[PDB]
Design a protein around this ligand. Structure first.
Ligand SMILES: CCCCCCCCCCCCCCCC(=O)O
Ligand code: NA
Length: 256
């Protein structure tokens, strides 16, 4: 949707009509969006070792004090900062992990993204066109006392979970919640942002998976995403539609 959609999105973040959203914020947000791509270019050619040592993660102990307990862990994060760089870090401070990526078309484009994220040292599973359901694999990883990483703030389909996000209705994936209730693994919200010419990363307290309510779980995970985004409102570079009302009557029919 571009800058116009980004504008309409930041509007919900700072409680403002889109036209009145501060321009310095918009400038910062687009600069972050541009930075992600500029970094994706060089990232495979950088020294992942130096980045493993130099960069850090606030309250990472949450993750360590769960894998050492043999549970496995769900690392659920929004599209903020550079999530690909945070992946590199984990590879260098744990090892290869498993995530999923929406299968793009053309396949030539998808094959370019896999070749990129494989050059960073982790495993991506497509949501379609697999020898198995990705959910099946991820569950077996969590059972093998391992961590997974999942983009968890946007899933605009019939499978999506109707949650409130900055006081408006959107839909987020249930994957993080189901895999957590099932394997009993720890569900950790995670946030990434840009910190000067560097990178910021933080792991947050695990959520209550007891109730079994996927809805209230995903909701609490959105309330955490929201608070973190409002803390770094220029790092959440979402240029695609997020909220339902920003969709056409056509694209909204697609989700029932
Ligand atoms: C602080 C803990 C570290 C966690 C590291 C998170 C790694 C996330 C990488 C997953 C990539 C998923 C790509 C799908 C998103 C897209 O391209 O639209
Ligand atoms: Na202006």
């Amino acid at each position: 949707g571009g800058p116009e959609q980004l504008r309409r999105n930041l509007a919900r973040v700072v409680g403002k009509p889109p036209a009145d959203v501060p321009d310095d914020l918009i400038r910062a947000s687009l600069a972050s969006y541009a930075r992600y791509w500029r970094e994706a270019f060089r990232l495979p050619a950088m020294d992942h070792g130096r980045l493993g040592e130099q960069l850090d993660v606030i309250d990472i102990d949450h993750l360590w004090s769960a894998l050492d307990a043999g549970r496995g862990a769900v690392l659920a994060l929004p599209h903020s900062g550079n999530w690909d760089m945070a992946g590199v870090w984990l590879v260098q401070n744990y090892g290869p992990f498993t995530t999923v990526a929406e299968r793009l078309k053309p396949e030539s484009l998808y094959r370019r993204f896999v070749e990129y994220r494989e050059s960073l040292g982790f495993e991506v599973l497509p949501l379609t066109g697999g020898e198995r359901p990705p959910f099946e694999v991820l569950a077996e990883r969590l059972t093998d006392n391992r961590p997974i990483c999942l983009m968890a703030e946007r899933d605009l389909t019939r499978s999506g979970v109707q949650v409130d996000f900055f006081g408006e209705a959107t839909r987020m994936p249930a994957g993080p919640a189901k895999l957590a209730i099932e394997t009993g693994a720890a569900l950790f919200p995670v946030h990434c942002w840009f910190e000067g010419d560097g990178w910021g990363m933080r792991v947050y307290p695990e959520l209550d998976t007891s109730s079994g309510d996927v809805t209230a779980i995903t909701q609490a995970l959105a309330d955490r995403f929201a608070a973190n985004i409002a803390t770094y409102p220029a790092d959440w570079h979402m240029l695609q539609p997020q909220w339902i009302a920003d969709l056409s009557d056509e694209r909204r029919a697609r989700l029932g």
